[PDB]
């Protein structure tokens, strides 16, 4: 199924996934499109933090729902 990954840069990313897939596989797909490693990636669904140990079905993430993308921001 398709989902939406909305950034805070006004940019919407679409990924073809399955409802039983883990979050880290989705972050691997984001790395496949972009080259950003998953430790630098954070995902938010309806104000809730996503953990890589669970699946999309565990958070009831379904076809073409909207995610949020915030990046790891460390300085110095």
């Amino acid at each position: 199924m398709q989902i939406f990954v909305k950034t805070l840069t006004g940019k919407t990313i679409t990924l073809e996934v399955e409802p039983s897939d883990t979050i880290e596989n989705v972050k691997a797909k984001i790395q496949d499109k972009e080259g950003i490693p998953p430790d630098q990636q954070r995902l938010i669904f309806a104000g809730k933090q996503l953990e890589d140990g669970r699946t999309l079905s565990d958070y009831n993430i379904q076809r073409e729902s909207t995610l949020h993308l915030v990046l790891r921001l460390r300085g110095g």
Binding site: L73, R74, G75, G76
Partner: protein, 83 residues
Amino acid sequence: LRCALGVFRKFSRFPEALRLALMLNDMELVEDIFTSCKDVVVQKQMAFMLGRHGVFLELSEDVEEYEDLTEIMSNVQLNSNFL
């Protein structure tokens, strides 16, 4: 004395030039000594006389001196929730 720059060149923001206070917003980010005035000058830049400033503090010194911006954005607002 340099700390009455933000609130009292909102005086000078709209009539003279909207870039002029933005050139004075540049004068904020030049006098970077050190944190105490630096915190309080940009306290007002979020929810006290205008917003729309959260795109000018993601420069290459994002440790805490340019990581004030998110703390300006909602955390002191959360301290205003902690009120």
